Symmetry: C2
Subunit: 129 residues, 2 copies
Amino acid sequence: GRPPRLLCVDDNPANLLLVQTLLSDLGAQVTAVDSGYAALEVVQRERFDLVFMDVQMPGMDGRQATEAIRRWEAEREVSPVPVIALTAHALSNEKRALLQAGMDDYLTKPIDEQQLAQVVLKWTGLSLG
Amino acid sequence: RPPRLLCVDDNPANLLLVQTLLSDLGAQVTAVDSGYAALEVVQRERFDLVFMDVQMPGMDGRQATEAIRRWEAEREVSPVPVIALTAHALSNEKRALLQAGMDDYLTKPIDEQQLAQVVLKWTGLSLGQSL
């Protein structure tokens, strides 16, 4: 299958580089941005197969960035991109709030290659590795 | 804070190579696929220096540099050095890059030492073992 085109969003540069590098090494075409504001702007510009969205970011958190994306997709009329939350340790009510914001799924940090490969295949049909 | 660098190339393998070498030197790196993307991300984020592929469809690296320079002038923002990445350019092509507002160029056989020299020359910032 073709390489998946993935967007990674994280306000921690070291964690962003770690997840980006795991994905690039597994053959994904990765874009890596540093904020929810960046995520909205790059999703307007580019068609991704899937977005990995850090939940905790200042100013615009992952839920607010996903809401921004969903509002633009609806107003602009664009096929929805899967959005996967990357979260520390979320209880049921927090996971329900991620889905209510328009997120599709979640992974609990720290993020590993197998969890990333499995969620990309589930949501896109494309294999990594 | 480490140097923040932008890489622009419409060839995914060549983009990943340059991005990997700049991240290896300790830079915070953004990698985008087009001149259109280069303009939009230069408006959004503050880079110390941009590496720009010359040949891209729709908006080539010269046109993207002109777009950046026009935005910098109107928006009133400190200019960013722009370095062309070229396969093997003729003298007329090298002169055309500078006419478009590009500061300098590198030829395709890129290595980490050359990238670090270009960043030191155009930004004063050290990378690699001197980061």
